[PDB]
Amino acid sequence: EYTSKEELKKTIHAAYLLLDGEFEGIDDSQKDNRVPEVDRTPAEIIAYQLGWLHLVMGWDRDELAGKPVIMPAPGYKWNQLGGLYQSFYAAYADLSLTELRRLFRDTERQWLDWIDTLSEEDLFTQSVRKWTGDKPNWPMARWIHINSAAPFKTFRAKIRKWKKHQRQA
């Protein structure tokens, strides 16, 4: 849980910067290189974030604009996450690693900008939005956490492990 919008933004941005910082020294040519120890490539690691950040911002933007929201995505049910992730990877597969990092930087800024428009009540009380559902402990802030602060930390571990196994067992 978070104490405030301020702490939420701080935590997200710190984790973003540590994640992106790991990509320094990874060559564009290495973006699709897979090692058995890590389930994702460097390209997939960023494309995964792009996919979820845009999806979640989309839910909120669409709901407020009067576009009914289908979650998680129009052609993917919650039981089809595997396919959803592949659609993320496919959508960004053409971008260089450098281009991916620039898109991720702009997208994380969009994310913080969107959060800045939310009141503390919007963030931390349930049933303000329809898309967050009505379950206790799942207000906007939780959905935001599990799609930014949390995966930015998890996927930082992933890219660090990928880098390790470029050099050693």
Author numbering: 16 to 184
Sentences from the paper on this structure:
The precursor PdDfsB is cleaved by subtilisin to yield biologically active Slf, and the chemical gradients of both proteins between two growing colonies could be accurately modelled. However, remarkably, the dfsB gene is widely distributed across Gram-positive and to some extent Gram-negative bacterial kingdoms (PFAM entry DUF1706). PdDfsB adopts a four-helical bundle core structure that belongs to the DinB structural superfamily. The most strongly conserved region of PdDfsB is the C-terminal helix, which is present within the mature Slf sequence.
A 12-kDa polypeptide was shown to be localised exclusively to this region and is derived from a precursor protein termed DfsB (PdDfsB). To help understand structural changes upon DfsB/Slf conversion, we crystallised recombinant, His-tagged PdDfsB and solved its atomic structure using X-ray crystallography. PdDfsB does not follow this pattern: it is a monomer and lacks the conserved residues responsible for coordinating metal ions. Also uniquely, the C-terminal helix of PdDfsB contains a conserved proline that introduces a kink in the helix. Finally, PdDfsB displays a strong positively charge patch that is, again, absent from other DinB family members. Coupled with the fact that PdDfsB is apparently secreted and processed extracellularly, our structural data suggest that it is not an enzyme. The processing site for subtilisin is highly solvent exposed and found within a flexible loop. Cleavage by subtilisin results in one of the central α-helices being removed, which would force the remaining polypeptide to collapse to a new state, or oligomerise, or bind other hydrophobic surfaces such as a lipid bilayer. The remaining sequence of Slf is shown in Fig. 1e, and it includes many conserved positive charges and aromatic residues. The pattern of conserved positive charge and aromatic positions is reminiscent of cationic antimicrobial peptides, which damage cell membranes.
